[PDB]
């Protein structure tokens, strides 16, 4: 765990994620702009074959990244490839959007979308250091207000804590998401309904997706890292839900 221990990198089942084996395992993604940490994480550094070149890696913290939690708990199909354009609704900061950039690689893009202003500023700085991220500080309920900037994304990720989550996702996925396209919702029942419990909230939102033409492929409840969160992986079908 310390700042000197040597570890062995290995490819994960998902293309673009790595496991750092040692006395305790870590989850790792290849850094794009090496030399720096966007939120103070311990970064692994290897060397590769001219004098050799240092390739830096980074460590996902599952108690921060709700996508790390989903990888680490174990998801079948994470819709983010090493070459795909992903949409990120609610990219509050680098603490997850930088890692999604690192896993889509230098070819694909990632349209970080945020509403407020202060993390908008820190996201501006982080996305100036990264090439793949383009940051949008338009509200996430107004796809027509930021429609000039995004073209036909491949899968959307959703971390908005708003209670109109299904409506926000339906709008953005209808206007921007490709057909047969991945959707990854991160549901938080304490922000949807404090009154009725988690399984009711999850079944309700899954049925809302099923109504709004997203066939839900699977569902995980990332327990030991975050109390009461679900992530639904779905596929935008657009024609013939059957």
Q: Is 129 a residue that touches another protein (CB under 8 A)?
A: no
Q: Is 203 a residue that touches another protein (CB under 8 A)?
A: yes
Separation between Cα atoms, residue 151 and residue 143, nearest integer Å: 12
Question: For residues 90 and 71, is the Cβ–Cβ distance under 8 A?
Answer: no
**If residue 19 lies in a helix (H) or strand (E), which one and from where to where?**
strand 18-21
Q: Is 43 a residue that touches another protein (CB under 8 A)?
A: yes
- The single residue among 21, 83, 164, 167 that binds another protein, judged by CB under 8 A, is 21
Q: Is 164 a residue that touches another protein (CB under 8 A)?
A: no
CB of 103 to another protein, least distance (A): 16
Q: Is 79 a residue that touches another protein (CB under 8 A)?
A: no
DSSP label at 23? S
Q: Per the structure block, which two tokens stand in for 114? A: 């945020």
- The single residue among 24, 50, 51, 52 that binds another protein, judged by CB under 8 A, is 24
The candidate with the shortest Cα–Cα distance to 90, out of 69, 64, 120, 70, is: 120
Q: Is 73 a residue that touches another protein (CB under 8 A)?
A: yes
Question: For residues 184 and 155, is the Cβ–Cβ distance under 8 A?
Answer: yes
- Based on CB atoms, which residue is closest to another protein, 81 or 229? 229
Instruction: Please return the burial class of 51, using the count of CB atoms within 10 Å of its CB with bins 0-12, 13-18 and 19+.
Output: exposed
Q: Is 216 a residue that touches another protein (CB under 8 A)?
A: yes
- The single residue among 15, 83, 164, 224 that binds another protein, judged by CB under 8 A, is 224
The candidate with the shortest Cα–Cα distance to 132, out of 169, 62, 69, 84, is: 84
CB of 53 to another protein, least distance (A): 12
Q: Is 51 a residue that touches another protein (CB under 8 A)?
A: no
Q: Is 141 a residue that touches another protein (CB under 8 A)?
A: no
- The single residue among 76, 83, 164, 167 that binds another protein, judged by CB under 8 A, is 76
């Amino acid at each position: 765990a310390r700042g000197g221990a040597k570890v062995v990198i290995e490819p994960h089942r998902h293309a673009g994620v790595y496991i750092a084996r040692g006395k305790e395992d870590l989850l790792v993604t290849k850094n794009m702009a090496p030399g720096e940490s966007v939120y103070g994480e311990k970064r692994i550094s290897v060397e590769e074959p001219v004098p050799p070149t240092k390739v830096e890696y980074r460590v996902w913290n599952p108690f921060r990244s709700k996508l790390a939690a989903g990888i680490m708990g174990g998801l079948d199909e994470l819709f983010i490839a090493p070459g795909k354009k992903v949409l990120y609704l609610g990219a509050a900061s680098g603490t997850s959007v930088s890692h999604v950039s690192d896993v889509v690689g230098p070819e694909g893009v990632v349209y970080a979308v945020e509403f407020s202003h202060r993390p908008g500023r820190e996201l501006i700085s982080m996305a100036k250091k990264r090439p793949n991220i383009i940051p949008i500080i338009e509200d996430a309920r107004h796809p027509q207000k930021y429609r000039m900037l995004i073209g036909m994304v491949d899968c959307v990720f959703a971390d908005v804590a708003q209670p109109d989550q299904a409506r926000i996702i339906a709008l953005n996925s209808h206007m921007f998401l490709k057909d047969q396209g991945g959707v990854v919702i991160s549901i938080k029942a304490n922000c949807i309904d404090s009154t009725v419990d988690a399984e009711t909230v999850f079944a309700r939102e899954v049925q809302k997706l099923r109504e709004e033409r997203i066939k839900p492929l699977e569902q995980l409840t990332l327990e030991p890292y975050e109390r009461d969160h679900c992530i639904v992986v779905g596929r935008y079908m657009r024609s013939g839900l059957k």
